[PDB]
Amino acid sequence: DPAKAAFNSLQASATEYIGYAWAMVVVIVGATIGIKLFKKFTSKAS
Amino acid sequence: DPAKAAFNSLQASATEYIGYAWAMVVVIVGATIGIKLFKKFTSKAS
Amino acid sequence: DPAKAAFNSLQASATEYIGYAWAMVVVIVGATIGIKLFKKFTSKAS
Amino acid sequence: DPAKAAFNSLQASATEYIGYAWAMVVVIVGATIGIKLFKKFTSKAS
Amino acid sequence: DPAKAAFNSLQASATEYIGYAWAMVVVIVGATIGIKLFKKFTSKAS
Amino acid sequence: DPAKAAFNSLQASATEYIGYAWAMVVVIVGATIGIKLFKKFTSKAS
Amino acid sequence: DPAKAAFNSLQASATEYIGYAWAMVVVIVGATIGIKLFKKFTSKAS
Amino acid sequence: DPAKAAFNSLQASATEYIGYAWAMVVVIVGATIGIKLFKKFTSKAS
Amino acid sequence: DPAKAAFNSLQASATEYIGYAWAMVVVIVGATIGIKLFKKFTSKAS
Amino acid sequence: DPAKAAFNSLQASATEYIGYAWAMVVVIVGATIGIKLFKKFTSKAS
Amino acid sequence: DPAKAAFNSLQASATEYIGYAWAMVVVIVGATIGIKLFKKFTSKAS
Amino acid sequence: DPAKAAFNSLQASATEYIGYAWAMVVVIVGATIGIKLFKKFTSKAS
Amino acid sequence: DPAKAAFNSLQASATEYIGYAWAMVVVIVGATIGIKLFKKFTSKAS
Amino acid sequence: DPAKAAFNSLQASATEYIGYAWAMVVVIVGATIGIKLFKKFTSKAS
Amino acid sequence: DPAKAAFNSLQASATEYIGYAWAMVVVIVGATIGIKLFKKFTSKAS
Amino acid sequence: DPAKAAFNSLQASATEYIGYAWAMVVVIVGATIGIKLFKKFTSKAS
Amino acid sequence: DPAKAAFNSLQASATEYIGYAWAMVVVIVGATIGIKLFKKFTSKAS
Amino acid sequence: DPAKAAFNSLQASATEYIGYAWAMVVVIVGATIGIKLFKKFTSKAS
Amino acid sequence: DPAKAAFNSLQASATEYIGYAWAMVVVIVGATIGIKLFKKFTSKAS
Amino acid sequence: DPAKAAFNSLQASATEYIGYAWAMVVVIVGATIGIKLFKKFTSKAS
Amino acid sequence: DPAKAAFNSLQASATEYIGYAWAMVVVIVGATIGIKLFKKFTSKAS
Amino acid sequence: DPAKAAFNSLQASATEYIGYAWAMVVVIVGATIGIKLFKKFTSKAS
Amino acid sequence: DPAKAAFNSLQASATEYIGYAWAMVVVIVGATIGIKLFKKFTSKAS
Amino acid sequence: DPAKAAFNSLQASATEYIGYAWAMVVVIVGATIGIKLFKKFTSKAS
Amino acid sequence: DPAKAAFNSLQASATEYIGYAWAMVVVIVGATIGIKLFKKFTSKAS
Amino acid sequence: DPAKAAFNSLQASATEYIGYAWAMVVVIVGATIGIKLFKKFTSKAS
Amino acid sequence: DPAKAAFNSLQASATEYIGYAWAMVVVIVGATIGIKLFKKFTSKAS
Amino acid sequence: DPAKAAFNSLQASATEYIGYAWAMVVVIVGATIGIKLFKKFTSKAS
Amino acid sequence: DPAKAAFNSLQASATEYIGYAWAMVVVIVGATIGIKLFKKFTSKAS
Amino acid sequence: DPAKAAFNSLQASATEYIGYAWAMVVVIVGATIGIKLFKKFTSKAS
Amino acid sequence: DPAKAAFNSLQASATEYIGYAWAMVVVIVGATIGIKLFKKFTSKAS
Amino acid sequence: DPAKAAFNSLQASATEYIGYAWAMVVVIVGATIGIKLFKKFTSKAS
Amino acid sequence: DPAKAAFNSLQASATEYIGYAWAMVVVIVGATIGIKLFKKFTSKAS
Amino acid sequence: DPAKAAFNSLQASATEYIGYAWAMVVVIVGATIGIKLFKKFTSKAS
Amino acid sequence: DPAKAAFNSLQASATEYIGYAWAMVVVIVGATIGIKLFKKFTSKAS
Amino acid sequence: DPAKAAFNSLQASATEYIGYAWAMVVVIVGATIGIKLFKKFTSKAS
Amino acid sequence: DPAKAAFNSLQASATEYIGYAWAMVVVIVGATIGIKLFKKFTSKAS
Amino acid sequence: DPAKAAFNSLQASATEYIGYAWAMVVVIVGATIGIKLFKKFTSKAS
Amino acid sequence: DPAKAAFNSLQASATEYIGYAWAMVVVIVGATIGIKLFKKFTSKAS
Amino acid sequence: DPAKAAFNSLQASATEYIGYAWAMVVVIVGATIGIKLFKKFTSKAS
């Protein structure tokens, strides 16, 4: 049954895309929150 | 009749295909909602 | 029903995100208030 | 989970930022309080 | 008539989906409003 | 003439589909509008 | 015309949401003004 | 209607938040007014 | 109108707040003037 | 002409929905603006 | 056209809110100015 | 316009405040001048 | 050509909406500035 | 030729269908834009 | 242009507020200077 | 060639539609900015 | 081009608003500074 | 009006102070005059 | 005019003290001149 | 401006105060000098 | 009411501070008047 | 530029206030010096 | 390639829009900063 | 061969259709982008 | 609820903060009062 | 091969469009950030 | 009333100083008159 | 200059006071010297 | 760049404001110091 | 798999953009805090 | 059979088209995401 | 990549605005501190 | 409360200061009276 | 700087004030000394 | 907790200033008191 | 982490600002206390 | 670094202001002490 | 810490003024006592 | 405590000044008494 | 230092006034002693 192997391949590819997207979004959100917190804490500390 | 047996086989195949489709939808929607909630809660927490 | 398991998985995942968000909220709010109270009391006492 | 690690990394980054803010505000607050006390006491003494 | 039962089953599935969505949205909205009110009342109290 | 009965039969049998479709839309739309207003008013109420 | 009944149901449903929102506003607003007036009048009285 | 219960939980939570806010503001205000009165009265007596 | 009750409720609290402020300010002012008059009238007579 | 009779039926139905929609908008918008004005005017007066 | 009626109702609600806000602000301003004038004239007279 | 009534009430209130301030200052000044003249004339006559 | 007529009708409705909006803005801004100036001049005079 | 008369008959039918379609669009577009501008101006009016 | 009329009305209201504030400040300053001069001249003559 | 006339007519027909759109956009935008500046300049002038 | 004309009209409206705001702020600032100078010089003269 | 009651409270207390000052000043002045007259008359007579 | 009455009362009190002091000084001077003249006359006559 | 009228009013009030002060000081100085000259001349003559 | 207890707690403390201040001022004044009377009566008697 | 005209008006008003203040202080100081010199020279002459 | 000319035309229109926006920004910011500096320096100088 | 001539004729027809379509898309997109940038720069400028 | 611990952590920290403020203000007041009494008593005694 | 040539042509066209879009985005972003920074720094400097 | 005890205690204290002052002056005066009478009686006898 | 006018006015008033004081002292000294020389010459003649 | 020209114009305007403020403050300071020195020297001269 | 290469290139571009953004934020925030601290410390020192 | 050759040729052509489409998707997505993050980071940084 | 050039240009522009803002703020702060110090020193010296 | 301890410490310090001041005033007054009595008695005795 | 010119104007004004005060004081002192010397010489020579 | 260290450093620094203030006041007070007795005792001794 | 370096640079700039502010305040306080002590000791010496 | 130059210019301006203040206070104090010593020595010598 | 150096500098300067004040008061008291003793001894010896 | 050291130092200095005060007075008194008996005894013996 | 020059100038002025006062007192004392000795010697001659 080729459909079985095709679905496994599609699910594996989707999981790989999920992993890469998670890495990218983690990097972007980390940068954004870092900048926001830096500005906020610098304004409040001074 | 062979037509009835073919119909039963097609119903079983359709159920199996719906099984893979449901699994793929679950994983993809889980990833999407996880990313959305991560961004939302991270932005609101800061 | 795969839908029943799917919705339950997202609800459990969302609860974890709320827990992580609440952990980050407390440390941020505690620092901001601690600085403001420190600046307010040191000016009143002096 | 990718999300669990990301939330913890942000909390560590936020906690690190609080340390810098406290160090900076202590230096700033000490200057304003010290000048206030210096001007107050130099006039009371005379 | 298969159409009657099919429509009724789809309507029941829709109602079940509405129930799950309502539970999830109540959880998320409760968390968000809790964080917002916590920040607001903490700022007003000090 | 069986033909005129056939045209009547489909038109008569059709109406139930519009009846059930209309009932299905109300519960689907009611959930969508219900969640939309719940998030809208709780956000402004806070 | 099920749509005529459906619109009336939504208008009745939306009216209830306004009732809950108004009850939530008055308790929150009263607490905000109550703290603000308490802080203002104690400073004036002293 | 799940929405009615959802609004009640938020209103109950909001009232709980108000009690904590009122309790906290009393302590902070009482300290500032106490210090203000202490410095004011010690100058008159001296 | 729900707002009409809210505005009347807030004004009722404000007048209640004013009474407490007036009660406290009389006690504080009376003490300050009494000490001031005691110091003034004692030095003049002695 | 079946089309001309049909077009009037849909056009008349469209006028009905606009009437019900306009009634719903007034209720929702009036509540939103009322709360916005209530929060704005209360803070200024206090 | 419902728009004109909605606008008129909104304007009436705004005027009523303005009236309540004016009453409250007159009360509060009168209280504060009375306290200030009392403490200034008592200081001057003695 | 409530502003005219508020200003008139405030001016009237300032008027009776001035009245009591004058009533108290007349008594205080009379007492002080009486003591001064008593001690001056007793010293001179004796 | 009915497109031009529709465009003109929408333009006229927009102009009417601008009229109502301008009336409401004048009322609200007048009330707010009146309250602000009343408080400012009252605090300055006393 | 019967053919040349036919297309004119269909063309004549095409003219009337467009006539009602244009009439239908204006009331729907007017309702959509009228509500959209109503929400915009009232929000900015406050 | 309703904006020009609004500006004119606001300027007129500001002028009336200026008049009321001037009257009140004249009364207050007159009373205070009268008390001060009464005390000074009574002390000097005695 | 009817194709050239058809495209030219459609291209020509788009010209005044842009004209009506541009005419309406200026009216709407001028209303929005006029209100926005009126609120901004009135607050700063006070 | 309509855009250039719209921009020029907006700039002209802004200039008129600036003129009105300048007149209002000159009036208000003159009044406040006159009151302050009156109080200061009246206190100094006595 | 609490202010009127407060003003008479101070004046009633201020009246008591004058009685206390007058009682003591007669004793002190009586002693000063008595010693002076004693020294004057014992020398002139002798 | 409170100043008129206060000054008149102060002048009347001053006149009363002047009268009492005049009586006392007449008594004292009479006694002193009498004893001195008595001593002188007895010394000379002998 | 009301400033000119206020300045004239306080100047006239001050002149009236000088009149009363001059009357009182003339009376007091006359009494004191009369007593002193009486005691000097009765001491010298005898 | 959270504020009703809060106001009373401050007033209860405020009265206590008055008791502490009145005890301290009596001690200070007793030395000031005692030293003044000691130097006054020693010089006269000696 | 309205700024130059506003500043010139403010400076002219300030200078006129200066003139009034000088006119008042001359009278007050003349009265004080006259009373002082009258008492001094009457004491020395007698 | 008409797209090249289209992109050039869009860039030119955007540049014209930037020019108009910059002119309007200069005017508005100049007016606002002028008002702010006028108020600040007028308050500081007096 | 008529086939080659037909292919060339339809190729030229397609080329001119692409030309007209390119012109239409250029003008429509230019209008849309002009309106969008007009609104954007007008909102940002004010 | 994470909010219950969050408010207690801040409220406990605020109570801790007041302790240092009360400790420092006693040290500051002790020096200011001590110097004031030292300069007062050495001047009176000498 | 027409296929590879067509694909390369589309790739080159996409690259050219990307370059032109990047240029336009650079212009728009530069203008917007320039205006934002101008307003921010002008407000902060003053 | 703390003031009642304070004045009464001081008046009692002043009485003690009067007693000591009266006691010491008799010793001093007795010496002065004693020596003067001693010298004058011996000179007249001798 | 107001200062110069005030200074010479005060100098003129001082000169008049000097003249009056000189006249009075001449009268008093004349009387005293006359009576003293009268007594001295009558005693010497005897 | 338009921004550089705008900054230069704002700086020039600020310098002009500084000049006006300097002139006004020189006038006011001269007046106040002249009055204070006049009082001081007329008090010292007598 | 071109997807992995595309994801890696996109993440690298994101990281480089983050670096440039961090540099820009550092510069801007440094300038802002520098201006704020300069104006704070200059105000405190004077 | 020619079937295998046809299938293999179609598969190879499909693979080549997939590769070309993948390259086109990579470049287009890279450009789009680059512009998106450029705008995001320039907006956040400012 | 145009992104690097765009970021560098934006950073250079931000540096230029920083320089202009620093110049303007130095000028304004210098003027304000000059006025403040002038008033303080002319009040102290005289 | 730390306020009670602070007040008690202040009162104890005041008592100590009173003791030292009493010692100094007794010794100084004793020396002064000794010198005065020495001079007086050596004058009278001889 | 205008500060140097203001300082020089204030110093010239002070020098003029000093000269006026010296003239007034020397006249007053000469008159006082002449009166004293006349009295002394009439007591001595006669 | 950085705050506990920060408060202790401020309290420790405040104690250091009190040491310098007490050292300086003793030197100043000793000079002023020493001069007063030098002038007091020299006049009494001689 | 560029944020750590940015925080360090900001703290260094703050330390430099503190040094400059300390120098300026030392100079200003030295001048003020020098003038005060000069005036006080000059008055005491004479 | 513009901050260093700004601070240096501010300190230089402060030093020049200190010099001017010293120049003025020397003259004022010299005049006051000259008048005081002139009066003292002319009263003692005569 | 510059504060300690500033305190030491002020103490040294204060010692310097104390030295000059002591020299001046020694000169003044020497001259005064010399004149008084000269007059006393010339009166006694002659 | 620094206060105890200061008071003892002042008392030690005060006792020190008394020693020189008694040293000088006996020298002056012995001279005045010595010259007095010298004039008394020689006249009586002769 | 300005203090050095000011103190030296004041000491020189004090010495000048001392010399002038010495000359005046020598003249006056010589005249008085001459008159008294002349009266004594002529009395002793007769």
Residues sharing a CB contact under 8 Å with residue T8, sequence separation 6 or more, in sequence order: none
Q: Are AN17 and AK37 in contact (CB under 8 A)?
A: yes
Tell me how far apart the alpha carbons of residues AE18 and AE16 are, in angstroms, rounded to a whole number.
5
Residue type present at position M38: F
Q: Are Z28 and X41 in contact (CB under 8 A)?
A: no
Tell me how far apart the alpha carbons of residues M5 and M10 are, in angstroms, rounded to a whole number.
9
Residue where the block lists tokens 């020059």: AN5
| From Q3, Q10, Q14, residue closest to X34, measured CB to CB | Q3
Q: How many CB pairs under 8 A join O and T?
A: 39
Tell me how far apart the alpha carbons of residues K20 and B16 are, in angstroms, rounded to a whole number.
67
Tell me how far apart the alpha carbons of residues M41 and O21 are, in angstroms, rounded to a whole number.
6
Closest among Z25, L2, AK41 to AL28, alpha carbons compared? AK41
Tell me how far apart the alpha carbons of residues AC3 and Z41 are, in angstroms, rounded to a whole number.
11
In DSSP notation, H3-46 reads HHHHHHHHHHHHHHHHHHHHHHHHHHHHHHHHHHHHHHHHHHH-
Residues sharing a CB contact under 8 Å with residue V24, sequence separation 6 or more, in sequence order: Q45, Q46, T7, T10, T11, T14
- Name residues 10-39 of chain T within 8 A of AB (Cβ): 37
3-state secondary structure of E45: helix
Q: Do I38 and AA6 touch (CB under 8 A)?
A: yes
Q: Do L27 and R7 touch (CB under 8 A)?
A: no
| From P16, P27, P31, residue closest to M21, measured CB to CB | P31
Q: Are Z36 and AC4 in contact (CB under 8 A)?
A: no
How far away is chain AG from the Cα of AM46, in angstroms, using its nearest Cα? 19
Query: What subunits touch chain U, counting only 3 or more CB pairs under 8 A?
Result: G, H, I, R, Y, AA, AG
In DSSP notation, AA2-41 reads HHHHHHHHHHHHHHHHHHHHHHHHHHHHHHHHHHHHHHHH
Asked if AK touches AH (at least 3 Cβ pairs < 8 angstroms), the answer reads yes
Tell me how far apart the alpha carbons of residues AJ13 and C29 are, in angstroms, rounded to a whole number.
27
Residue type present at position AD36: K
Please name the residue of chain W whose CA is at the shortest distance from the CA of residue Z32.
W18
Please name the residue of chain AE whose CA is at the shortest distance from the CA of residue A32.
AE44
Q: Are AF3 and AE39 in contact (CB under 8 A)?
A: no
Beta carbons within 10 angstroms of residue N19's beta carbon? 13
Residue type present at position Y9: S
Closest among T17, S10, AB11 to V34, alpha carbons compared? AB11
Residue to test with chain H: of G16, G17, G35, G38, most H Cβ within 10 A: G35
Please name the residue of chain E whose CA is at the shortest distance from the CA of residue B42.
E32
Beta carbons within 10 angstroms of residue O40's beta carbon? 16
How far from AI36 is each of O7, U37, Y28, AL33, AL37, CA to CA, in Å? 69, 21, 30, 15, 20
Tell me how far apart the alpha carbons of residues M23 and M17 are, in angstroms, rounded to a whole number.
10
Q: Count of residues for chain S?
A: 46
Tell me how far apart the alpha carbons of residues AJ38 and AK33 are, in angstroms, rounded to a whole number.
12
Closest among AB6, G43, AC24 to V10, alpha carbons compared? AC24
Tell me how far apart the alpha carbons of residues I31 and I39 are, in angstroms, rounded to a whole number.
12
Q: Please work out, in degrees rounded to the nearest 5, the angle formed at the alpha carbon of residue AL7 by the alpha carbons of AL5 and AL11.
A: 115
Tell me how far apart the alpha carbons of residues F23 and F20 are, in angstroms, rounded to a whole number.
5
Residue N1 is encoded by which pair of tokens? 């030729």
How far from S3 is each of L15, V7, V28, CA to CA, in Å? 16, 40, 17
Tell me how far apart the alpha carbons of residues F37 and V22 are, in angstroms, rounded to a whole number.
70
Chain C CB contacts of Y2 below 8 Å: 19, 22-23, 26
Tell me how far apart the alpha carbons of residues AC19 and AH2 are, in angstroms, rounded to a whole number.
9
Residue type present at position G3: A
Q: Do AM14 and AI22 touch (CB under 8 A)?
A: no
Q: How many Cα atoms occupy the beta-carbon half-sphere of Z31 within 13 Å?
A: 23
Residue AA19 is encoded by which pair of tokens? 């007693």
Is AN10 exposed, middle or buried (CB count within 10 Å of its CB: 0-12, 13-18, 19+)? Answer: buried
| From H3, H10, H17, residue closest to E30, measured CB to CB | H10
Residue type present at position AJ2: P
Please, which contacts does AB19-26 make with residues 24 or more away whose CB atoms are closer than 8 Å?
AB20/V41, AB20/V45, AB21/V41, AB21/V42, AB21/V44, AB21/V45, AB21/AH31, AB21/AH35, AB22/V45, AB22/AH31, AB22/AH35, AB24/V42, AB24/V45, AB24/V46, AB25/V44, AB25/V45, AB25/V46, AB25/AH35, AB25/AH38, AB25/AH39
Residue V19 is encoded by which pair of tokens? 């003139």
Residue to test with chain J: of I7, I17, I18, most J Cβ within 10 A: I7
Residue-number span of the structural domain to which AF44 is assigned: 1-46
Largest CA distance in chain J: 68
Tell me how far apart the alpha carbons of residues M34 and L1 are, in angstroms, rounded to a whole number.
10
In DSSP notation, Z1-46 reads -HHHHHHHHHHHHHHHHHHHHHHHHHHHHHHHHHHHHHHHHHHHH-
Tell me how far apart the alpha carbons of residues N30 and C16 are, in angstroms, rounded to a whole number.
47
Terminal C-alpha separation, chain AL: 68
Chain AE CB contacts of A28 below 8 Å: 37
Q: Are AG21 and U35 in contact (CB under 8 A)?
A: yes
How far away is chain AD from the Cα of AE1, in angstroms, using its nearest Cα? 33
Give the CATH number for residue AD25.
1.20.5.80
Tell me how far apart the alpha carbons of residues R14 and R18 are, in angstroms, rounded to a whole number.
7
Tell me how far apart the alpha carbons of residues U14 and U9 are, in angstroms, rounded to a whole number.
8
Tell me how far apart the alpha carbons of residues Q20 and O9 are, in angstroms, rounded to a whole number.
12
Tell me how far apart the alpha carbons of residues W2 and X26 are, in angstroms, rounded to a whole number.
8
Residue to test with chain R: of L36, L38, L42, most R Cβ within 10 A: L42
In DSSP notation, M4-46 reads HHHHHHHHHHHHHHHHHHHHHHHHHHHHHHHHHHHHHHHHHH-
Q: Do K7 and N42 touch (CB under 8 A)?
A: yes
The backbone torsions φ and ψ at residue AA25, rounded to the nearest 5 degrees and listed phi first, read -65, -35
Tell me how far apart the alpha carbons of residues F6 and H11 are, in angstroms, rounded to a whole number.
60
Residues sharing a CB contact under 8 Å with residue AN2, sequence separation 6 or more, in sequence order: AK22, AK23, AK26
Q: Are AJ27 and AK12 in contact (CB under 8 A)?
A: no
Residue Y10 is encoded by which pair of tokens? 């801040």
Tell me how far apart the alpha carbons of residues S20 and S2 are, in angstroms, rounded to a whole number.
27
Closest among AF3, AJ13, A34, AE37 to AD22, alpha carbons compared? A34
Tell me how far apart the alpha carbons of residues AH33 and AN28 are, in angstroms, rounded to a whole number.
12
Method: cryo-EM
Question: Would you call U45 an interface residue with chain R, using a CB distance cutoff of 8 Å?
Answer: yes
Please name the residue of chain AB whose CA is at the shortest distance from the CA of residue AH18.
AB7
Closest among K16, Z18, C29 to AE34, alpha carbons compared? Z18
Q: How many CB pairs under 8 A join L and R?
A: 36
**Count of structural domains within chain N:** 1
Residues sharing a CB contact under 8 Å with residue K39, sequence separation 6 or more, in sequence order: I25, I29
Chain P CB contacts of O14 below 8 Å: 46
Chain AD CB contacts of AF9 below 8 Å: none
Radius of gyration (Cα) for chain S, nearest Å? 20
3-state secondary structure of AJ1: coil
Is AI36 exposed, middle or buried (CB count within 10 Å of its CB: 0-12, 13-18, 19+)? Answer: middle
Residue AA3 is encoded by which pair of tokens? 């003031």
Residues sharing a CB contact under 8 Å with residue AC1, sequence separation 6 or more, in sequence order: AF16
Q: Are Z30 and W21 in contact (CB under 8 A)?
A: no
Residue AD39 is encoded by which pair of tokens? 């104006």
Chain V CB contacts of AC31 below 8 Å: 18, 21-22
Residue B31 is encoded by which pair of tokens? 């990833």
Q: Are AM20 and AG34 in contact (CB under 8 A)?
A: no
Residue AH34 is encoded by which pair of tokens? 């002449």
Run of H or E residues at O25: helix O2-45
Please name the residue of chain A whose CA is at the shortest distance from the CA of residue B26.
A11
Residue where the block lists tokens 């030729």: N1
Tell me how far apart the alpha carbons of residues Z30 and Z28 are, in angstroms, rounded to a whole number.
5
Residue type present at position J43: S
Helix axes C2-45, E2-45, angle to 10 degrees: 10
Run of H or E residues at Y13: helix Y2-45
For E13-44, give one letter per residue: b (16+ CB within 10 A) or e.
eeeebbebbbebbbebbbbbbbbebbbbbbeb
Q: How far is CA AG5 from the centre of its chain?
A: 28
Question: What stretches of AL1-46 show up as alpha helix (H) in DSSP?
Answer: 2-45
Tell me how far apart the alpha carbons of residues V30 and V17 are, in angstroms, rounded to a whole number.
20
Q: Do H10 and G27 touch (CB under 8 A)?
A: no
| From AK2, AK21, AK25, residue closest to AF26, measured CB to CB | AK2
